[PDB]
Design a protein around this ligand. Structure first.
Ligand SMILES: O=C(NCc1cccc(-n2ncc(-c3cc4cnccc4[nH]3)c2O)c1)[C@@H](O)Cc1ccccc1
Ligand SMILES: [Ca+2]
Ligand SMILES: [Cl-]
Lengths: 250, 58
């Protein structure tokens, strides 16, 4: 996160940190006690699936304060429509090996109904993006969880205002074009969370961009609304052997 | 009332029904109040709420 602030401890309780061999990989979003939403692209270069760890209740990476909860990732589910090394359909559903325990510091973000998301949430200007990603383009990553308020753009507008992947219907733009504020590498898979009438909802997944906080460019986010039904169906399904699962989309 | 306008007055989820009918709903871990629009937590840790902040104002 570029140009944000520290998310006060416990104020981002749905934020997940994904580790591979103890190394920072990506972010994620807790949507219930055993399910995490992330970005497909995060898992391209994964060698040994069995070394993937999800951490909940994380804040300051430099210390252990006992609010942290680590879980093995049992399943990584990616839509059939996702092509490795590209940006479209940038979503993953992760099944934890064991549920996390909900606490003051560990809470799921609401996965909204599609209709609600499309008709209402989509029109809420500002939303929060978070992660332990790069603080600057070509810079060091964050030790403390960072958060940033970003405004959402209609795609027509994003294209108009931008100055190379299309922005597809499975995406949306959010942020600023003045090079001051953005999500960055290391943040991907994390939440784009939207407030409505006292409750927060998952509307986006930190995905990609033309570099980080590049003048004349916006941050691009996976349009979660397109995937609600897909996600819901999967969450009702029995686990399958083997970590990686490609599931048809729609 | 219609869902597309003002969220049908619903706090959370909205369903249009046959006629001049509307039904509001709530996410798991919430229940719908008698006003037919409002949602109240039924659990300790409902989704999309920040405990330390809920407490901060409690
Ligand atoms: O290398 C791949 N996967 C492996 C992989 C693992 C973990 C992280 C990364 N990774 N590298 C760059 C960014 C990134 C830049 C950025 C700027 N603004 C906002 C969000 C942003 N994120 C990023 O998340 C890639 C391919 O899938 C290619 C691909 C596809 C999509 C994004 C990035 C790389
Ligand atoms: Ca810590
Ligand atoms: Cl575990």
């Amino acid at each position: 996160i570029v140009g944000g602030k520290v998310c006060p401890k416990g104020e981002c309780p749905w934020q997940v940190l994904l580790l591979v061999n103890g190394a920072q990989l990506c972010g994620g979003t807790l949507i219930n006690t055993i399910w995490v939403v992330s970005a497909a692209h995060c898992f391209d270069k994964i060698k040994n699936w069995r070394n993937l760890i999800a951490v909940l209740g994380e804040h300051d990476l430099s210390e252990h304060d006992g609010d942290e909860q680590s879980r093995r990732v049992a399943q990584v589910i990616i839509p059939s429509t996702y092509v490795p090394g590209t940006t479209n359909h940038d979503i993953a559903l992760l099944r934890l090996h064991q549920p996390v325990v909900l606490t003051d510091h560990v809470v799921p973000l609401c996965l909204p109904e599609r209709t609600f998301s499309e008709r209402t949430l989509a029109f809420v200007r500002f939303s929060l993006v978070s992660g332990w990603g790069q603080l600057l383009d070509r810079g060091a990553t964050a030790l403390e969880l960072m958060v940033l308020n970003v405004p959402r753009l209609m795609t027509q507008d994003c294209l108009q205002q931008s100055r190379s992947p299309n922005i597809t219907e499975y995406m949306f733009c959010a942020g600023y074009s003045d090079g001051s504020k953005d999500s960055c590498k290391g943040d991907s898979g994390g939440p784009h969370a939207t407030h409505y009438r006292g409750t927060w909802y998952l509307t986006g997944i930190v995905s990609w961009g033309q570099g980080c906080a590049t003048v004349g460019h916006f941050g691009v986010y996976t349009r979660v609304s397109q995937y609600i039904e897909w996600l819901q169906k999967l969450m009702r399904s029995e686990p399958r052997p083997g970590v990686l699962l490609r599931a048809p989309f729609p | 009332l219609i869902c597309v306008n003002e969220n049908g007055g619903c706090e959370q989820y909205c369903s249009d029904h046959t006629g001049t009918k509307r039904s509001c709903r709530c996410h798991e871990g919430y229940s719908l109040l008698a006003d037919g629009v409002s949602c109240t937590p039924t659990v300790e840790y409902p989704c999309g709420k920040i405990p330390i902040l809920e407490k901060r104002n409690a």
